Structure formats: structure tokens, C-alpha cells
């Protein structure tokens, strides 16, 4: 994510997505939007037995992953807590934890 | 400035049924015709 198009910022502010005060203040009582950031990240993945047999350095293991949609939200952009709870429960049960 | 101006075009790319898809006359022209055509074709395929 590299931001260089002013139109994207203008259109995100026209949609009341971005805060006009400062950074993202999550859990704060005065949260009024998010801030646009940049970052590039790359990871190397491999099945655990293949990494162990290769003497590769391992620093974490992914146990499960899932995706769904909040299609029951009041609006397209608005989130839906029920869908998120179902996703979390599904991943937890599948992972066995 | 391009050197070629040919291509095969969709001449009904701007046609949409806003009322069917709970859209508004001011919102509709702001939606990329790709999304509108995707909606139309997906609905037709599902009904077919």
C-alpha cells in the first residue's frame, strides 16, 4: 500500500471514512474515523514438516484461517457483529482450541 | 496520444435497473459500469 493519488483521500473523506483530527484512536470515546498509512510486508510460508526437515528457522505456525461476508449489515459499508462472531467461532472450532 | 483507436465495445454499458437493485438516480452514475453489469449478469445466471 503506497498512497499517491489525492483523489483516493478526497473520496474517502467524502464518504466520512477518515478522521479529520489525527490518527486512529481505537477504544477512545471520541473515535471519528481512521488514518491512511503505508506498509509493505512479505512472509515465507511452508508446511511444518517440510520446514522442520529443511532445518529452516520457524517463528510461528498458522493453525487455521477462514473468510465470510457481512451481507446482513444495515448498509454495505457497515459491519455486522453476528457474522464476525460466527467467523471467530468457526475458526476456533475447526482449529480445535 | 494513442496510435490505435480500435476495439470491440459494449454500446449498452450505461444501462441499469436502479430500482430493482435498491439504488438511487444520483448513486447509479457513480457506480462503475463493471459492477452494474456484474450485478445484472449474476442475477440472470442465478435465475437461469
Amino acid at each position: 500500500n503506497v498512497l499517491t493519488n489525492p483523489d483516493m483521500t478526497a473520496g474517502l473523506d467524502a464518504g466520512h471514512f477518515l478522521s479529520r483530527s489525527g490518527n486512529c484512536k481505537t477504544f477512545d470515546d471520541e473515535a471519528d474515523g481512521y488514518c491512511r498509512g503505508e506498509a509493505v510486508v512479505t512472509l515465507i510460508l511452508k508446511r511444518l514438516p517440510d520446514a522442520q526437515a529443511d532445518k529452516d528457522p520457524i517463528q510461528a505456525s498458522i493453525l487455521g484461517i477462514a473468510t465470510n461476508h457481512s451481507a446482513e449489515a444495515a448498509s454495505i459499508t457497515r459491519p455486522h457483529a453476528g457474522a464476525q462472531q460466527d467467523l471467530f467461532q468457526q475458526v476456533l472450532t475447526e482449529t480445535g482450541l | 496520444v494513442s496510435g490505435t483507436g480500435f476495439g470491440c465495445w459494449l454500446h449498452e454499458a450505461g444501462e441499469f435497473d436502479a430500482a430493482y437493485f435498491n439504488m438511487s438516480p444520483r448513486e447509479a452514475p457513480q457506480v462503475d459500469p463493471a459492477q452494474r453489469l456484474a450485478l445484472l449478469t449474476a442475477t440472470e445466471a442465478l435465475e437461469q
Binding site: 466520512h16 444495515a74 448498509s75 459499508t77 | 436502479a18 444520483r26
Partner: protein, 76 residues
Amino acid sequence: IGTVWRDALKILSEESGLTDEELTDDTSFADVGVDSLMSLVITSRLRDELDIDFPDRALFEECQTIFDLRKRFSGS
């Protein structure tokens, strides 16, 4: 209330791009296509110009149809 209601209906028709022929009492805000995103613009313009009190809840949530919006505007 009459002048405020007429100006509000004009504002709603402008932002929605509808006629005021079909933006009647029976009209449902969902069928019109007003999201929370658009209701925010409606309420912001409304407060800025007409000076009416529609904070923190927009219109589509509490007011399902034009009936509810008109009732809220009447200040009954």
C-alpha cells in the same frame, strides 16, 4: 412546520435525485436507496442550512419511511 417540511423535502429530493412524485408518504427509505452514508449527508446539510436537530442517528435507522421523517420534522 410547513415551510421547514417543504425545504426538507426539496433537500431530500436533491440528494436522492428523485421526483417528489414517488417520494411520497408510503415510500420506504430502503427502496429509495438511501444508505447510512447518504443519510449522513442529508442530516449534515439539513442541520447546516435548516438548523433542525437530527444528530447521531441519521434518518434511515429510526425513520423507515417518509412518514417517520415528516413526523420527526413536525416536532409532535
